[PDB]
């Protein structure tokens, strides 16, 4: 299972056809054949890495996901860098099962995950409090959070606080463009929602984070720039990654061995946009520095 046959490797011509059907499977369109050929070479290299890395018996595996035609350097730059930086709980939690999570979004080639992370926890807390699941505007936070840097990264806590002090509009009222424009908040009329505050989970503390997740999805950060993270396909991700967090995501559950993480790279990444990250190793940073900096919205 995922995402090619051993028969595909026995021949250049086969590799090409494999690459062809992977482009179709992801609606990949390139400028010219020069890029297409370039992309094949990248594809070919990540295939080789995947195939070699999947021999090794870890608890997760890599795959020809949406980022398979990208070099890790290319990937580092474009989908990593969203951070401007600096009591008996259920055995299992998954807020997807309570209707509190909207469908998976795609930040595109924009360092905006700080807004995506925040907005996701906001949508969730309002469902939990008021009973309705809505989609809210990442573009608004992108454009309007003066402490953040738009597509060059920002702070989740800053985005949450904006929503607590002012409000946020609906996705459909302020749609995502993946580019920072001027603030258009006042042009859209009244806010759709307003939170009442922001709290921070005690950092470097797994138990504290789990407790929080059991009440609300939490906005957390991790280091996502690694090639194993990039090509991640399924299973419990156990490393390797450092503690130089560079990406913002939403913790929307956990089990005995893992914390459930909603990413914002579309459904063509990971377990349909999600990753399960190893927990309980005692390590106070968390795998990929997951426990570094966690915030969640408050809604009376
Ligand atoms: Cl520490
Ligand atoms: Cl801990
Ligand atoms: Na969304």
Curated annotation (Swiss-Prot):
What this chain does, per the entry, is described as:
Cysteine proteinase with a high level of diversity in substrate specificity, an amino acid bearing a large hydrophobic side chain at the P2 position is preferred.
UniProt xrefs under Pfam families: Inhibitor_I29, Peptidase_C1
Listed as disulfide-bonded, the cysteine pairs are 110-151, 144-183, 241-288
Q: Which organism is it from?
A: Carica papaya (Papaya)
Q: Which reaction does it catalyse?
A: Hydrolysis of proteins with broad specificity for peptide bonds, but preference for an amino acid bearing a large hydrophobic side chain at the P2 position. Does not accept Val in P1'
Q: Which residues form the active site?
A: 113, 247, 263
Q: Quote the protein name from its UniProt record.
A: Papain
GO BP field: proteolysis
**What regulation of activity is recorded for this protein?**
Repressed by the active-site-directed cysteine protease inhibitor E64 (L-trans-epoxysuccinyl-leucylamide-(4-guanido)-butane) produced by Aspergillus japonicus. Inhibited by the inhibitor of cysteine proteases from Trypanosoma brucei (TbICP, rhodesain) and Colocasia esculenta cv. Kaohsiung no. 1 (CeCPI, tarocystatin). Repressed by leupeptin, a peptidic cysteine, serine and threonine protease inhibitor.
Keyword presence, Signal: yes
Highest taxon of the source? Answer: Eukaryota
Q: How does activity depend on temperature?
A: Optimum temperature is 50 degrees Celsius. Unstable upon 65 degrees Celsius.
